[PDB]
């Protein structure tokens, strides 16, 4: 996240950190995600696309640091990895960039409620905040697009939602942004999501609840003028989410 503040998971208790294991001894961070229900985390397909081998990913909940433990953190394996059929990437945008990960603990359980682990809410069918709403994004992504490492502390920032008319203007992204995407930026292009923040949440308050409005998906550069961050429009994927999620 460029700009922002450093936070702890108590402030984003539904944030999930996804890592991949290497036949060598190292685990590296891949992307962020959000907890929807006890056993399901939602992230972005492009984070898995290149290596869809579920057994090599590990998911941690209750995590405030990247490679050091946080007391209260829970570790899970990916029991199911569901990528979106119709997922596409062009020279910028990713289309239908949403993925579901069913988690299982080594003891056979899903997440448990704590002060650092909570679920986030889902919007109702095609329901979004209006452009102008200030939403917050969180993640361990880059702090500068030229960095080659990720911060060790979780960060958060606030961005405002912008209309499609503004984002589809030629000097922004043209028709690369579709109705199934959302754009968010800082009025003064000072803070924004960036690489390593993919899959994480764009949370806004809708009808009283803190709702997962978008998933970090792409952007041209980070915190670049007239280059907003583009997010997957969750309110438009509800059927798809439903047809794959069940029980507690």
């Amino acid at each position: 996240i460029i700009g922002g503040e450093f936070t702890t998971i108590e402030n984003q208790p539904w944030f999930a950190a996804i890592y991949r294991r290497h036949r060598g001894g190292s685990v590296t961070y891949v992307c962020g995600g959000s907890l929807m229900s006890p056993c399901w985390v939602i992230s972005a397909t492009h984070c898995f696309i290149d290596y869809p081998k579920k057994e090599d990913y590990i998911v941690y909940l209750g995590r405030s640091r990247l490679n050091s433990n946080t007391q209260g953190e829970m570790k899970f394996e990916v029991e199911n990895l569901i990528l979106h059929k119709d997922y596409s990437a062009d020279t910028l945008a990713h289309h239908n960039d949403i993925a579901l990960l069913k988690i299982r603990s080594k003891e056979g359980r899903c997440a448990q409620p704590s002060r650092t682990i909570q679920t986030i809410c889902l919007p109702s069918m095609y329901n979004d905040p209006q452009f102008g709403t200030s939403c917050e994004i969180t993640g361990f992504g880059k702090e500068a697009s030229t960095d080659y490492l990720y911060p060790e502390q979780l960060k958060m920032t606030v961005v405002k939602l912008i209309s499609h008319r503004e984002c589809q203007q030629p000097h922004y992204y043209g028709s690369e942004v579709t109705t199934k995407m959302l754009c968010a930026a800082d009025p003064q292009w000072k803070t924004d999501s960036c690489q390593g923040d993919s899959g994480g949440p764009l949370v806004c308050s809708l009808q009283g609840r803190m709702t997962l409005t978008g998933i970090v998906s792409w952007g041209r550069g980070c915190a670049l003028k007239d280059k907003p961050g583009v997010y997957t429009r969750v309110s438009h994927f509800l059927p798809w989410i439903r047809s794959h999620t069940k029980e507690e």
Partner: peptide, 9 residues
């Protein structure tokens, strides 16, 4: 206690 979506504590 139990999950209350969207709640920070």
């Amino acid at each position: 206690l139990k999950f209350q979506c969207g709640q920070k504590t």
